[PDB]
Amino acid sequence: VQFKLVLVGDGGTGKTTFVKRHLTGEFEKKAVATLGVEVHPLVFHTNRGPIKFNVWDTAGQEKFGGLRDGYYIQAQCAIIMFDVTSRVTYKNVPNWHRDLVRVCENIPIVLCGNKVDIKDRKVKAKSIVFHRKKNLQYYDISAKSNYNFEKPFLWLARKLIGDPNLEFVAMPALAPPEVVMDPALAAQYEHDLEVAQTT
């Protein structure tokens, strides 16, 4: 079965673009009009069987402050997103994490810095520290290129199932890349996180 996943972060960070990479989850999405949400059934296939993350994507109301309690309620996991080309989105991560945990106190949470395909990166590995204090997991991602798409969900699945050896045995069908994520740049970004991490 299944887990409610809430996807939060400033307007314009690429939450909608992200959740939409998973093609069947977009085709089978369900409206929850009473809370201004579209729930996308993101199925992933593990060595322990199938897991379904029901990802709750807003209809843009985060542009105007915290979300309603009904949005967060009964969430079993979360992704907090920021835009690595917009420093204020990173600065707002504490506010999202507070908005989130007030309603969902013991859930696994991953932090994702999106748009790493844009050449002029502002929030670099050296400054990404918020996950460390809260012992949350961080990934760089690029929704438009599918780069690291599966990472946040694999880390959440390991935490929810309590199996640090879980693996995905097949990739979901994803929208074809709309930008190129340069493999050398990606490698260097992962390296920089590793090097920031040993500090």
User: Would you tell me which residues interact with ligand GDP (CB under 6 A)?
Assistant: 11-17, 114-115, 117-118, 142-144, 179
b/e string for 182-199 if b means 16 or more Cβ within 10 A? Answer: eeeebeebeeebeebeee
Residue 7 burial (10 A CB sphere; 0-12, 13-18, 19+): buried
DSSP letter for 175, please: P
> What is the number of the residue whose Cβ is closest to ligand GDP?
14
Place of tokens 């887990």: 3
| 152, interface contact from ligand GDP, Mg ion, none, CB < 5-8 Å by kind | none
| 42, interface contact from Mg ion, ligand GDP, none, CB < 5-8 Å by kind | none
| 117, interface contact from ligand GDP, Mg ion, none, CB < 5-8 Å by kind | ligand GDP
Nearer to ligand GDP, 22 or 144 (CB): 144
| 18 and 143 Cβ atoms separated by less than 8 Å | yes
| CB 174, min distance to ligand GDP, A | 13
DSSP letter for 173, please: P
Nearer to ligand GDP, 17 or 76 (CB): 17
Rounded CA-CA distance 167/164 in Å is: 9
Q: Which of residues 10-29 bind Mg ion (CB under 5 A)?
A: 15-16
| CB 46, min distance to ligand GDP, A | 25
| CB 143, min distance to ligand GDP, A | 4
SS3 64: helix
